[PDB]
Amino acid sequence: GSSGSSGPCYDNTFANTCAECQQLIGHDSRELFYEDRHFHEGCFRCCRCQRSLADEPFTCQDSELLCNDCYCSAFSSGPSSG
């Protein structure tokens, strides 16, 4: 990490910025504004298998989103039957 964190500021950015790639939105791209935040038709893909989530059946979660092919997983795999 670093140190010497400077102070904040006040900017007037009038343009949606993907909450994933931190990039503006509007470049001939389909906006996928969600309840959480805005995202690009692409960046808005399962963070497990990178699957497109454009009006598809999935299980949205907190600060995360898993597709119907991921959400239904078995974390058990990780650890063992200690």
Using CB under 5 A as the criterion, which residues of the chain lie in contact with Zn ion when the complex forms? 18, 20-21, 40, 43, 46, 48-49, 67, 70
**Backbone angles phi and psi of 76, in degrees to 5:** -40, -45
| Closest distance to Zn ion from the beta carbon of 66 (Å) | 6
Which residue number, 27 or 82, has a Cβ lying nearer to Zn ion? Answer: 27
Q: For residues 48 and 64, give the distance between their C-alpha atoms in angstroms, rounded to a whole number.
A: 10
Evaluate whether 16 touches 31 at the Cβ level (below 8 Å): yes
Alpha helices in the chain (DSSP H): none
Which residue number, 9 or 40, has a Cβ lying nearer to Zn ion? Answer: 40
Q: For residues 40 and 25, give the distance between their C-alpha atoms in angstroms, rounded to a whole number.
A: 7
Which residue number, 21 or 60, has a Cβ lying nearer to Zn ion? Answer: 21
Residue closest to Zn ion, measured at CB: 18
| Closest distance to Zn ion from the beta carbon of 68 (Å) | 8
